[PDB]
């Protein structure tokens, strides 16, 4: 079964850093790309970046330069998300999604999401 197992929820300081995870299984990691989709509650779906598991090709959204970065671990079949300079606007559910190769980009298998919340309370 192709399922992108994903981590739990986190809660950090504004301006801190967090690292997300998404364990791929049931299929060869270097075949299909990884894409991540951000959905703020009550808002629309947003596409933030894509990675190539074979050789780490990086393509990011224009509005998220220097803010979201993409890494993979080919040994463990895992795709990582490191976030930097967090703000209260960043609180959303981050969906780890599979992806067909390149600019075709139809996400054939989706994930479950992690409730990321930014607050000082």
């Amino acid at each position: 079964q192709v399922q992108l197992q994903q981590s739990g929820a986190e809660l950090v300081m504004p301006g801190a850093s967090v690292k997300l995870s998404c364990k791929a299984s049931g299929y060869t990691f270097i075949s299909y790309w990884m894409h991540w989709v951000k959905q703020r509650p009550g808002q629309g779906l947003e596409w933030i970046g894509e990675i190539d598991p074979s050789d780490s090709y990086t393509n990011y959204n224009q509005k998220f330069k220097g803010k979201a970065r993409l890494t993979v671990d080919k040994s463990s079949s895992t795709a990582y998300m490191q976030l930097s300079s967090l703000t209260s606007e960043d609180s959303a559910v981050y969906y780890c999604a599979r992806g067909y190769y390149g600019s075709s980009g139809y996400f054939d298998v989706w994930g479950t999401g992690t409730t990321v919340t930014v607050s000082s309370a």
Binding site: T28, I30, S31, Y32, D52, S54, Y57, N59, Y100, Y101, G102, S103, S104
Partner: protein
């Protein structure tokens, strides 16, 4: 008669081509995508189906035959029946093994090259800009976007010469 591409200069191959058997992988300034040449994979699937039309279905309606399962011995005619049945089985097993060998070899041989069409298509606009690329990735020096890869897929590619780089 191997052509030395699928085991040759196509050394790894990418595993995502679920729509077709072949494809035109690429790299652009706007994103390194993929493709699937429906003509070549359609030709390959059509010849596999033509191979299986003589094989999968439409057998020979052989209704009544000789008794092959035997019992306590009767005579020389039983030995003859066993011998003719065994020689038929050995001939047909040799013949099926041979048929599998020739058709697997022919399937590997035909599903191999036929990428010279892309070569000759790309030549007349690739001959001038930094000369000739053939190592397995066509390092096409025609600075273009996904429209040109669409034209290469569509087999509707013109020749806009890139004279900015003639030698280097």
């Amino acid at each position: 008669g191997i052509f030395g591409a699928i085991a040759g200069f196509i050394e790894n191959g990418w595993e995502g081509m679920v729509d077709g058997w072949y494809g035109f992988r690429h790299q652009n300034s706007e994103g390194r995508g993929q493709a699937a040449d429906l003509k070549s994979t359609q030709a390959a699937i059509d010849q596999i189906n033509g191979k299986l039309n003589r094989l999968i279905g439409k057998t020979n309606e052989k209704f009544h035959q000789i008794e092959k399962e035997f019992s306590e011995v009767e005579g020389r005619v039983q030995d003859l029946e066993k011998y003719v049945e065994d020689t038929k089985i050995d001939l047909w097993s040799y013949n099926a093994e041979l048929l599998v060998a020739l058709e697997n070899q022919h399937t590997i041989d035909l599903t191999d090259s036929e990428m010279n069409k892309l070569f000759e298509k790309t030549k007349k606009q690739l001959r001038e800009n930094a000369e000739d690329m053939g190592n397995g990735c066509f390092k096409i020096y025609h600075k273009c976007d996904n429209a040109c890869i669409e034209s290469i897929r569509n087999e509707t590619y013109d020749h806009n010469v890139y004279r900015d780089e003639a030698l280097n």
